[PDB]
Structure 1
Amino acid sequence: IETVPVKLKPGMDGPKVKQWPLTEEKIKALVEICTEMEKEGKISKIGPENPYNTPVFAIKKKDSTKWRKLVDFRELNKRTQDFGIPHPAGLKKKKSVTVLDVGDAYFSVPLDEDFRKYTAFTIPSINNETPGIRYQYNVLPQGWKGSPAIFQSSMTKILEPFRKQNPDIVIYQYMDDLYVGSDLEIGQHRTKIEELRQHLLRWELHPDKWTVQPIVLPEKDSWTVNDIQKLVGKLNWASQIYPGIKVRQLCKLLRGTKALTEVIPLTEEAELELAENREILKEPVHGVYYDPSKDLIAEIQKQGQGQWTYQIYQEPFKNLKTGKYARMRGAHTNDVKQLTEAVQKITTESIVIWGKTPKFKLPIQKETWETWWTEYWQATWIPEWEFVNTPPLVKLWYQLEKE
Structure 2
Amino acid sequence: ETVPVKLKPGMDGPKVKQWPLTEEKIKALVEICTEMEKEGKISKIGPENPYNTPVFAIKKKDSTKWRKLVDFRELNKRTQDFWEPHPAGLKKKKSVTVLDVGDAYFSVPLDEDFRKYTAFTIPSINNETPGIRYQYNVLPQGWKGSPAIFQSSMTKILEPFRKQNPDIVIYQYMDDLYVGSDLEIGQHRTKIEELRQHLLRYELHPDKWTVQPIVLPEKDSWTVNDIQKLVGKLNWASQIYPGIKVRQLCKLLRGTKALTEVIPLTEEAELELAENREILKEPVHGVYYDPSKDLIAEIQKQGQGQWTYQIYQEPFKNLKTGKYARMRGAHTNDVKQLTEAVQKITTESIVIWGKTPKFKLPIQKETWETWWTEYWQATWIPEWEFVNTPPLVKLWYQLEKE
> Could you tell me how far apart the structure 1 residues matched to 2:85 and 2:287 are?
23
Q: Could you tell me whether the CA contact under 8 Å between 1:216 and 1:278 is conserved in 2?
A: yes
CA displacement, residues 278-323 of structure 1 (integer Å, 9 cap, x when unaligned): 0000000000000001000001000001000000000000000000
The number of aligned residues is 402
CA displacement, residues 245-297 of structure 1 (integer Å, 9 cap, x when unaligned): 00000000001100000000010001000100000000000000000010000
> Could you tell me how far apart the structure 2 residues matched to 1:203 and 1:251 are?
50
CA displacement, residues 64-100 of structure 1 (integer Å, 9 cap, x when unaligned): 4211110000000000000169310010011100010
> Could you tell me how far apart the structure 2 residues matched to 1:37 and 1:63 are?
22
> Could you tell me how far apart the structure 2 residues matched to 1:82 and 1:299 are?
27
Alpha-carbon distance change, 85 to 375 in structure 1, aligned in 2, over 3 angstroms: farther
Structure 1 position 402, deviation (Å): 2.9
> Could you tell me how far apart the structure 2 residues matched to 1:379 and 1:203 are?
11
> Could you tell me how far apart the structure 1 residues matched to 2:298 and 2:366 are?
19
Select between 41-50 and 209-218 the one with higher mean Cα deviation.
209-218
CA displacement, residues 106-161 of structure 1 (integer Å, 9 cap, x when unaligned): 00000001000000000000000001000000000111000000000011100000
Q: Could you tell me whether the CA contact under 8 Å between 2:97 and 2:202 is conserved in 1?
A: no
> Could you tell me how far apart the structure 1 residues matched to 2:329 and 2:160 are?
42
Q: Could you tell me whether the CA contact under 8 Å between 2:346 and 2:356 is conserved in 1?
A: yes
Q: Could you tell me whether the CA contact under 8 Å between 1:85 and 1:173 is conserved in 2?
A: no
Q: Could you tell me whether the CA contact under 8 Å between 1:297 and 1:359 is conserved in 2?
A: yes
Corresponding residue of 2:339: 340
Alpha-carbon distance change, 85 to 306 in structure 1, aligned in 2, over 3 angstroms: farther
CA displacement, residues 191-225 of structure 1 (integer Å, 9 cap, x when unaligned): 00000001012291100221121100101111000
> Could you tell me how far apart the structure 1 residues matched to 2:362 and 2:83 are?
33
Q: Could you tell me whether the CA contact under 8 Å between 1:85 and 1:174 is conserved in 2?
A: no
Q: Could you tell me whether the CA contact under 8 Å between 1:85 and 1:149 is conserved in 2?
A: no
Q: Could you tell me whether the CA contact under 8 Å between 2:98 and 2:202 is conserved in 1?
A: no
Structure 1 position 387, deviation (Å): 0.2
Corresponding residue of 1:172: 171
SS at structure 2 position matched to 1:44: coil
Corresponding residue of 1:209: 208
> Could you tell me how far apart the structure 1 residues matched to 2:336 and 2:302 are?
15
> Could you tell me how far apart the structure 1 residues matched to 2:222 and 2:83 are?
57
Alpha-carbon distance change, 308 to 133 in structure 1, aligned in 2, over 3 angstroms: same
Q: Could you tell me whether the CA contact under 8 Å between 1:6 and 1:112 is conserved in 2?
A: yes
> Could you tell me how far apart the structure 2 residues matched to 1:243 and 1:341 are?
34
> Could you tell me how far apart the structure 2 residues matched to 1:64 and 1:136 are?
27
Structure 1 position 62, deviation (Å): 1.5
> Could you tell me how far apart the structure 1 residues matched to 2:369 and 2:83 are?
30
SS at structure 1 position matched to 2:129: coil
Corresponding residue of 2:38: 39
Corresponding residue of 1:384: 383
CA displacement, residues 348-368 of structure 1 (integer Å, 9 cap, x when unaligned): 000000000000000000000
Alpha-carbon distance change, 322 to 41 in structure 1, aligned in 2, over 3 angstroms: same
SS at structure 1 position matched to 2:84: coil
CA displacement, residues 319-370 of structure 1 (integer Å, 9 cap, x when unaligned): 0000000011111111111000000000000000000000000000000000
Question: TM-score of the superposition, structure 2-length normalised?
Answer: 0.99
> Could you tell me how far apart the structure 1 residues matched to 2:389 and 2:202 are?
48
Q: Could you tell me whether the CA contact under 8 Å between 1:61 and 1:379 is conserved in 2?
A: no
Matched, 1:89 2:99: no
> Could you tell me how far apart the structure 2 residues matched to 1:281 and 1:298 are?
21
Structure 1 position 184, deviation (Å): 1.1
Structure 2 unmatched runs, 5+: none
> Could you tell me how far apart the structure 1 residues matched to 2:330 and 2:184 are?
32
SS at structure 2 position matched to 1:207: coil
Select between 286-295 and 183-192 the one with higher mean Cα deviation.
183-192
> Could you tell me how far apart the structure 2 residues matched to 1:209 and 1:305 are?
22
Alpha-carbon distance change, 217 to 85 in structure 1, aligned in 2, over 3 angstroms: farther
Select between 195-204 and 153-162 the one with higher mean Cα deviation.
195-204
Corresponding residue of 2:266: 267
> Could you tell me how far apart the structure 2 residues matched to 1:33 and 1:386 are?
31
Corresponding residue of 1:300: 299
Q: CA RMSD in A?
A: 1.5
Alpha-carbon distance change, 124 to 109 in structure 1, aligned in 2, over 3 angstroms: same
Structure 1 position 3, deviation (Å): 1.1
Question: Matched residues, percent identical?
Answer: 99
SS at structure 2 position matched to 1:161: helix
CA displacement, residues 169-193 of structure 1 (integer Å, 9 cap, x when unaligned): 0011000001100111211111000
Q: Could you tell me whether the CA contact under 8 Å between 1:358 and 1:384 is conserved in 2?
A: yes
> Could you tell me how far apart the structure 2 residues matched to 1:294 and 1:401 are?
28
> Could you tell me how far apart the structure 2 residues matched to 1:258 and 1:145 are?
62
> Could you tell me how far apart the structure 1 residues matched to 2:390 and 2:126 are?
40
Select between 355-364 and 180-189 the one with higher mean Cα deviation.
180-189
Alpha-carbon distance change, 256 to 272 in structure 1, aligned in 2, over 3 angstroms: same
SS at structure 1 position matched to 2:64: coil
SS at structure 2 position matched to 1:45: coil
